[PDB]
Design a protein around this ligand. Sequence first.
Ligand SMILES: NC(=O)C1=CN([C@@H]2O[C@H](COP(=O)(O)OP(=O)(O)OC[C@H]3O[C@@H](n4cnc5c(N)ncnc54)[C@H](OP(=O)(O)O)[C@@H]3O)[C@@H](O)[C@H]2O)C=CC1
Ligand SMILES: NC(=O)C1=CN([C@@H]2O[C@H](COP(=O)(O)OP(=O)(O)OC[C@H]3O[C@@H](n4cnc5c(N)ncnc54)[C@H](OP(=O)(O)O)[C@@H]3O)[C@@H](O)[C@H]2O)C=CC1
Ligand SMILES: NC(=O)C1=CN([C@@H]2O[C@H](COP(=O)(O)OP(=O)(O)OC[C@H]3O[C@@H](n4cnc5c(N)ncnc54)[C@H](OP(=O)(O)O)[C@@H]3O)[C@@H](O)[C@H]2O)C=CC1
Ligand SMILES: NC(=O)C1=CN([C@@H]2O[C@H](COP(=O)(O)OP(=O)(O)OC[C@H]3O[C@@H](n4cnc5c(N)ncnc54)[C@H](OP(=O)(O)O)[C@@H]3O)[C@@H](O)[C@H]2O)C=CC1
Lengths: 459, 459, 459, 460
Amino acid sequence: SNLPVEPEFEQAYKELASTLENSTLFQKNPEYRKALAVVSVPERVIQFRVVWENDKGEVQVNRGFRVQFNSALGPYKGGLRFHPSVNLSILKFLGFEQIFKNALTGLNMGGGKGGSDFDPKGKSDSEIRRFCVAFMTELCRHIGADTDVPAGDIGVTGREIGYLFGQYRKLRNSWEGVLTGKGGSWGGSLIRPEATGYGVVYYVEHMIAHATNGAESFAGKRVAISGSGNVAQYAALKVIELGGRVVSLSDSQGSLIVKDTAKDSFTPAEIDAIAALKVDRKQIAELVTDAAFADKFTYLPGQRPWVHVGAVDVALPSATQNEVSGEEAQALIAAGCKFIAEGSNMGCTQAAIDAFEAHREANKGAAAIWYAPGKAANAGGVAVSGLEMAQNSARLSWTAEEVDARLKDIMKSCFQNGLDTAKEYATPADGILPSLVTGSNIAGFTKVAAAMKDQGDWW
Amino acid sequence: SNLPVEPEFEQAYKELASTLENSTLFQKNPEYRKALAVVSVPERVIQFRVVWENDKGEVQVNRGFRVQFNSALGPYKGGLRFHPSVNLSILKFLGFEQIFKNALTGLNMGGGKGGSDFDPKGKSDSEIRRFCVAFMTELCRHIGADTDVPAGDIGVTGREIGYLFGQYRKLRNSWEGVLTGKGGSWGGSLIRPEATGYGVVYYVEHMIAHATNGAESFAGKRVAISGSGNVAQYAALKVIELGGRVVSLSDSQGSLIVKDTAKDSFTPAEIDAIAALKVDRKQIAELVTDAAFADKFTYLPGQRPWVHVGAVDVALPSATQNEVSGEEAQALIAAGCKFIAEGSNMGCTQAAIDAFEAHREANKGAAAIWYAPGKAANAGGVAVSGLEMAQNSARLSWTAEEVDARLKDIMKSCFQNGLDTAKEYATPADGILPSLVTGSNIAGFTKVAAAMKDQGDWW
Amino acid sequence: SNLPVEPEFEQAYKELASTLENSTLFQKNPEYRKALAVVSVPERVIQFRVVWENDKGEVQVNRGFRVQFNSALGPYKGGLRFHPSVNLSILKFLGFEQIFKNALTGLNMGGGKGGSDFDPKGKSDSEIRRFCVAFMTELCRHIGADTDVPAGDIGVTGREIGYLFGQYRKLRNSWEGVLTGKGGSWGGSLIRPEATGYGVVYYVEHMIAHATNGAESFAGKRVAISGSGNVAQYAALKVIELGGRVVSLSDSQGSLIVKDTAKDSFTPAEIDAIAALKVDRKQIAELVTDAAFADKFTYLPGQRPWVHVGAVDVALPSATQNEVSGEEAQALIAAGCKFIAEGSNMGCTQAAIDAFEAHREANKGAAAIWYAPGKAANAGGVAVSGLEMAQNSARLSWTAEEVDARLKDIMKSCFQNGLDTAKEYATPADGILPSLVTGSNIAGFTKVAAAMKDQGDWW
Amino acid sequence: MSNLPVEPEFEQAYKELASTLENSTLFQKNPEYRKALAVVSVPERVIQFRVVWENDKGEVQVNRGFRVQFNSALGPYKGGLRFHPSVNLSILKFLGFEQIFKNALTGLNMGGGKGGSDFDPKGKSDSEIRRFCVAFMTELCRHIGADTDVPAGDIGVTGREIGYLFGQYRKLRNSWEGVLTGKGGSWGGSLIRPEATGYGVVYYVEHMIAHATNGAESFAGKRVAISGSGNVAQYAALKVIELGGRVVSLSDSQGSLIVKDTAKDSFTPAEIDAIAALKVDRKQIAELVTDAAFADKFTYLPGQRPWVHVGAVDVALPSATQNEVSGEEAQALIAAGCKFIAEGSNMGCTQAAIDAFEAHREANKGAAAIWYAPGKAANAGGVAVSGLEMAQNSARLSWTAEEVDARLKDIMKSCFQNGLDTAKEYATPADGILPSLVTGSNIAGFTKVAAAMKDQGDWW
Ligand SMILES: NC(=O)C1=CN([C@@H]2O[C@H](COP(=O)(O)OP(=O)(O)OC[C@H]3O[C@@H](n4cnc5c(N)ncnc54)[C@H](OP(=O)(O)O)[C@@H]3O)[C@@H](O)[C@H]2O)C=CC1
Ligand SMILES: NC(=O)C1=CN([C@@H]2O[C@H](COP(=O)(O)OP(=O)(O)OC[C@H]3O[C@@H](n4cnc5c(N)ncnc54)[C@H](OP(=O)(O)O)[C@@H]3O)[C@@H](O)[C@H]2O)C=CC1
Ligand SMILES: NC(=O)C1=CN([C@@H]2O[C@H](COP(=O)(O)OP(=O)(O)OC[C@H]3O[C@@H](n4cnc5c(N)ncnc54)[C@H](OP(=O)(O)O)[C@@H]3O)[C@@H](O)[C@H]2O)C=CC1
Ligand SMILES: NC(=O)C1=CN([C@@H]2O[C@H](COP(=O)(O)OP(=O)(O)OC[C@H]3O[C@@H](n4cnc5c(N)ncnc54)[C@H](OP(=O)(O)O)[C@@H]3O)[C@@H](O)[C@H]2O)C=CC1
């Protein structure tokens, strides 16, 4: 009751813990409640003022954060977020998810996450540059290639990463794998831009395969996507590559959907145009008036994709946390949606998830809508970041195939761990699909909890 | 609106800012609103998990904090608090006060403050020792004799300081002035135990002197005190030494008042007995049944001193923040109280302070009740801590007189700065006393704001 | 022939070397030839890029430097010069001079200097803050309160030291005597602003009083000063204070001379008005169109004051290196000047020095021109600077008086040491004044040469 | 402006780069890179220091020490250490400047640096060297590291000397790490490092010869004029002989040693080993005037470079030191029918010589032309395998001799190819004319580095 209310974090915690309860995990390993208690308080958090100069010469204040939540499995590893709503509660939820997502890679990476309430919108390239310079001045001392390795998230693209790296290098006089999402000439890995959205799809391929006994694929499926950022961009491109039709994309202002969802789609070209806007930080709203887009797409301001795509098969929330409500989950089920995986960390509201797992428990095999949590599906990104670290570590640069091969292995291993661990610790009824949320949460939590015990963080 | 609500901090901020507004400060120096904005975001904050072992062998979790709020004037300097209600909001308010209190010493000390929600009650000496060992393991890396110099506060006595020092020494392989409130054989300063409560009194001597033109002193005054800790203990002992009668003391459970407040008092003996209990962490409640105390004192459970001491002249809240309500301030005025200085940081509720300054504005000269804020009156302690640092720095140990001399200088200089700066920037009406809160807040804030400008924290 | 030609350095070196040569020193200490070889190669030098941003958002490149020449007698100590003339040669003469000057103060201080070719002229206060910030981002690692302590020289005042310090604190998370010449409230020392200037005058009191057997002092003396900066200003104000008439200041654009040199003088108010223009980085030329100056003075663009004063008794070169030519020295001689001390570092050319010593060998007693080197007369600045370090390490602030007192003492012993050493090692003919420069050199030099030997820096 | 010391060797290499960038569409397409050109040519950091050390007689001795940390956008600082009485800031700036870009071309993450000292190894006993290296590293190590700056060897700094520095580094830093390259086998070195630079030159030219003749010729049958007789010169020569080429010249700082019959005759590997031995002893090549074996077969030419005394010759490999090919000398090589010339040595050809070889490439179509390849493209093999030492030390393993030779060969193919293809995009040559390797090598190295610098906020 001394503790401040952190609702975004509490959500994250309660889903995880709840899935741990509704399982025979604590019957077999009662001691794990002590591990859950310990792990939930972060190892370390750094908060810090960031003072920076806008183009008009005026002095600006913003709030730096870096949650270093658990380094049992590896160095702290996790993205950076620049968005006006950024607080502790939020970066704590991401840091917490990140712990356990990172475990499912089978690479040695701890959970962390940081960022700022700095808003990159309205801001010049120069203003963003200064801000990164001041942000990295303070963050510099708490991070490092064997300590904590940040990367991007909402608002932190490879460009911001560039400015952050350059300043890290100035300060510490060291060239090392201290950041991921880096550009190719200077310690970047091939596949990293693509890795998150690729990962999601690769994971749903396996969900579909198993759900339908190899009958169906993304081949000719209708796929609603939300957001239009690095995740959703390359999620959409892979759906197309496997013959899927991407029927929707969105931003902060609205969703943009093909008028004929039954048969029409986005194209690599159209996506590349939306990418260009989000380097310049413009909204989708700007390109709906052009000829190519006006005839083909409806643009719905203030509206999310889910309830206006009609019939649809796969759903990939890739914008932000809490962007699929229970109103909106029921609508997807009713539109015959039978696969939903989170591109975005905590994309689904509890209420939505409660409809999805209730449905899976009520309907047999392929008749079920199958939810996969973000820590299982958007793990591709962080997993390649590990490969980036390893590349830097070994002091060489691997080929795109070499990496995409390893990404495929790792997304598959992660589906198989969630699935097997769901059958083992919370066996579904006859003909019912294992809980992918529960098995992923349990598999992640167990590997962590035991490594913490071995090391002495708890007894 | 992303920002979490931190009410203990917001209070601290709003009083300070309000006093800055109700003054011609921002007319003369409008730029200072930018300094107020910058200074209010802390330079750095470290939060960290603390895992420790109780005597029964079981694993325990608690929350470590260290607010490093402003290092403009000097290294971060500020106490450590172990109390169950400890959160960020709270340690931020103390850290914020500490910035500006420290400025009024004229020694080079930044504002900081840290602690834990660790509760020392119910706890063995061994349990406290382990906890300090684990607490200092993490705090070790963020602190140092030229960086940040902690000390005590509620729950952190010289004993806890001992355990913290020993572990700092183990870890960093360094013997330095990294902590204050240290014991004599190992870098302690003479007068430090006594310095805070001594300081308060020394400050009220000057309030009384000026208020009454040197007519009155603590000589035969009735002095209600709250709390029974290191502040209130040596506050009470100095009141007696100057011929004052200490009529009240309190703890968490209740207040303990002499049955005859008009003519009776506590004694150095009786106080030394109450001290012994608070090394062992027992309550006042335990010694009311003995012969000496049963006949002499009434003990009122759950009740604060203020409204049950009858007539009374001086009030010294020395327990904790927000322990004098407006209900309770009016009661003091009505009982002819004409001096109130805060031993405890933010001891008075706004509502109380609003009655006190309203009264001073309504009634002329000595007919006024005169409030002095904690940052002006409990500065004695931190000021000697500086002397402790200097002693360590010069590598020698000064005599008790040498120190008490410097303490006297420094408490007086601080009254004179509050007074002069109140007359200058917010001149009272004719025959009305300067605001000691406003002048102390302004004098503290200005020295800081200008040092920040010079250094480039703002422009 | 691999060595780059560094004219500024090899001068400082040849005058030093020839004075040692033109003495008995090498007869009784031939091993010291080896000491000269070693000392005159700097222990460490740091060169660096300083990328910074102007007010237009435009990228700007400048060259940073730190010359860490000798640390046998203490941590490197030196000022920072921001002037377009800056190269390695200029900093290497200043850094080398500083060795031996610091040796004459009696304090423990090495010989350092640095800066950059960045020119503060043109620049906004914004642009200086920004250069300063980027400047110290690189410098920071190479310095520290026990390692190397920089300060001001030409174009680095307390304003710039402010920006520098504040960045260094932000970078090293440490508050220390890393820079001297700091503001009062953040580790500054009283009498710094005034130190170098007063010191020059104080030194020359002892020169006057010796040469004239105490008959003349600075009262009713006519004094020509060059420069209008820190050294110049406060020397002028001191000469004025001691009954003297200051007939000249100057800057980069021209001299400013009283029309009536025989009877008239500069005033405090006129000096305080120029100082205000130098604070604002303006020229003397700005004010030649005023009541305040038009009638009383005569602006002389692109000349130095020496030839245009005629009636003159003392010359205080206080601007920059080699600002007194062979021809100009003869003018001063011809015009009856008897005393000349370098306020500026290496103020006089070898041609000019030679004339002053040829004259000193040529005329008995007060009838000669006495030349004092900078390393002796301008040592008040660095001496008090070391008393600022002393105060920072004692965590305390000394009085105006206490410092001035130390200053006068230090300067008296500097004169005395120089005088006696010249008397021992290069005894002048009957009646002839001892060589203050040959003395001052052999004095500083032998202390460092011995310190080195002891320490194994040579054998 | 006019405060800066006149640094001739640094300014030379600055100009050859700047001018080659101007003579292309690089600044038409990306005009902003003029800013980067200005930012990059100022060193990031530089460290000068005294080096007090003790001679064999017990006498104190002084020398100047240098480390130039020019650019670190593409990696940590990387480049050798030079012990030569000529050494000064200027020289070491050219070397480090060259390095930024050379490293840019191996495709590995390495920034640019170099250092050394005016210490002169000639006449010093092995004991005196050991002591210097001790003093030298004592100041140096503060500023370097496996992830900070990785020195190595250049002229006057062999594996003997590397070892002294490594052992002192290990003491001082309490660390066994990949802080130096060109190390011994037992202790963190790599196979094919001794060989690397010279092999790397002859692999790069093997490609030049392939392009000019569409695979129809090789080093087979070619006469090859080589200068210097150190690490670069020795193993370049060994690889020529291996590929059926005739090495007709070697040289040193005193003189040149040429075969009497340049047409039909060549050096044997055994003779190269006998010289390589003389240089481990810091003894002059001159000493062979007195062995009948060599006197019969060779001609020593005290005070002459070999370029005008080889008769007709085909390939020229400067492998000694900078500016060792005059305007005059380069003309005579055109006259002899040399059609291939690669700098083994860093900035080995003069501006006169570069200007003559480029003007000639543009005057003559196909294999009539003489083809110049810069230092940064051809000798990149040293630092490429140097860069593989670090990759091996980081992974804590050792690689087979041919694992490294293969990795090397592939990098030189990439480097030749990068230079050719970049030159066609930005400085398209006329029809039938060979693309400018020096231009395309400089452009491609520069743009990688300057793109990285933009990305990292070094300029904007
Ligand atoms: N990049 C990565 O490697 C990984 C990302 N993720 C998660 O995926 C999600 C998106 O990441 P990423 O694509 O990198 O971020 P980007 O900034 O690249 O894109 C963000 C997208 O989400 C939209 N968006 C952001 N915040 C909100 C909001 N509060 N309400 C509505 N729309 C919003 C943005 O709209 P607009 O363009 O208008 O701002 C934009 O379309 C995040 O939750 C992130 O944590 C998870 C794993 C890896
Ligand atoms: N020590 C120092 O140098 C300085 C202290 N202060 C301030 O003075 C105050 C007291 O400090 P200190 O005496 O060192 O602390 P101590 O622990 O020595 O004593 C605390 C006293 O306050 C009582 N108390 C503590 N918390 C509460 C609460 N929440 N409600 C009611 N009573 C409470 C305690 O009762 P119990 O014994 O039952 O716990 C005890 O009587 C604090 O606000 C502190 O910040 C300010 C400047 C310097
Ligand atoms: N400050 C100190 O503590 C000490 C200073 N000194 C020496 O005193 C001299 C000046 O220092 P300081 O007074 O702080 O300098 P300031 O920057 O305070 O002022 C320097 C003055 O000299 C003039 N000046 C500067 N450069 C030149 C030039 N290249 N040609 C002609 N005139 C010039 C300037 O003209 P303008 O204002 O137009 O630029 C300015 O008025 C230096 O030699 C310095 O080493 C020595 C010991 C201590
Ligand atoms: N080490 C490597 O892997 C690399 C080397 N290089 C370049 O190769 C060249 C030599 O390297 P390396 O073989 O290691 O050096 P070595 O010292 O082993 O050999 C250098 C040769 O050059 C001669 N030489 C040295 N200085 C001069 C001079 N001033 N005038 C004429 N001849 C001279 C030497 O003659 P003497 O024996 O009489 O001194 C010696 O025969 C340099 O330009 C270097 O930059 C370039 C890239 C990588």
